[PDB]
């Protein structure tokens, strides 16, 4: 709970890039407790998943950033 995983390890970066776009609702407040990261690197990593084209941008708000999965069907 104290400042864990600043700057990713490989043991969970695969755990991100396997299933973090599968989720219905994807949000830094959701991965901050699922993984062990203290925020603010989700927001860098979430924007680059947007920079690829995995998640799609919905909210775009200065304290609430919300995305979603790829639309399967």
């Amino acid at each position: 709970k104290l400042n864990n995983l600043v700057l990713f390890d490989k043991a969970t970066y695969d755990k991100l890039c396997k299933e973090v776009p599968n989720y219905k609702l994807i949000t830094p407040a959701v991965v901050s407790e699922r993984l062990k990261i203290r925020g603010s690197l989700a927001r860098a990593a979430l924007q680059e998943l947007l920079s690829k084209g995995l998640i799609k941008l919905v909210s775009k708000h200065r304290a609430q950033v919300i995305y979603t999965r790829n639309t399967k069907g």
């Binding site: 700057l7 990713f8 390890d9 490989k10 860098a44 680059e48």
Partner: peptide
């Protein structure tokens, strides 16, 4: 664009 980590991190 610090993607994973470098091998050195003080």
């Amino acid at each position: 664009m610090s993607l994973v980590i470098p091998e050195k991190f003080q």
